[PDB]
């Protein structure tokens, strides 16, 4: 209802970034190589001239993705990849840890993050000292999506202006953490959901988990081209509308589809 064309194109661009995080060619690639996607999984960034600044594969959980520069759109993107074995990853997905360093407490996710955190923050600082006029964006899909969200909420403690673009992100922490992510003056947050996606539903909210807002929920089905008319914004934090309002189930093909097959390049 309330979404523009250029913002829709930005959402598609960052979902294609998250999809390029799946390409094994873009992972562990030598710095300086351009971003390429098998089966045109990301032609909007592949034709945007994004250069790989760093590519990481298996560090810490399975932290995999790339930090890249985009001078056509003038921004530095840190995109995390989900899980190579996503169906084995959704099975053991519900422990909670004490994450009062941001507080209120988060979920494995923060484990892998704080494992890669010092090195990735050093590289991010170098990249943003390179181009101080570029926007810092963290993004990802599924597991990586979580690694993106926390990955931002732990770097806004410093004077970092970070925009977040998660696709099919699970729940990371309590309701206080959702409120903190919702109310933060260090950049805007774009949480994207799609249909009967069981990944934003898990871990269950009964067990203390909660997801922040706004929720950008697309009404399009699986394996179907999407239009901005199908995208609705949801304002209530931890709202039973959109994805969380969809009934229980395991529509994994709905999690496979986010503006295109986001997980099909590994």
Numbering used by the authors: 31 to 90, 92 to 124, 126 to 135, 138 to 141, 143 to 301
The study reports:
Lipases (triacylglycerol acylhydrolases, E.C. 3.1.1.3) are water-soluble enzymes that can catalyze oil hydrolysis, esterification, and transesterification. For the first time, we have cloned and heterologously expressed the lipase from Rasamsonia emersonii (ReLip). The functional analysis revealed that ReLip has an optimum acidic pH profile and was active on a wide range of substrates from short to long carbon length chains. Furthermore, ReLip is highly thermo-tolerant under extreme conditions such as in the presence of methanol.
Crystallographic analysis revealed the closed conformation of this lipase indicating structural properties driving substrate selectivity and tolerance to organic solvents. As expected, the catalytic triad of ReLip consists of the residues Ser177, His290, and Asp232, which are fully conserved in other lipases and esterases. ReLip possesses three disulfide bonds (C67–C72, C53–C300, C135–C138) that are also conserved in TLL. The three-dimensional structure of ReLip confirmed the presence of a helical amphipathic lid, indicating that interfacial activation might be involved in ReLip mechanism of substrate binding such as its ortholog TLL. ReLip conserves the residues isoleucine and tryptophan, but the residue phenylalanine is replaced by an alanine. The lack of this aromatic residue in ReLip might be associated with the preference for shorter acyl chains compared to TLL, while preserving the ability to cope with water-insoluble substrates. Another singular feature of ReLip is the presence of a salt bridge formed between Arg291 and Glu118 from the lid subdomain. The presence of this salt bridge in ReLip implicates in a higher protection of the hydrophobic pocket to bulky solvent, which can be correlated with the high tolerance of ReLip to organic solvents.
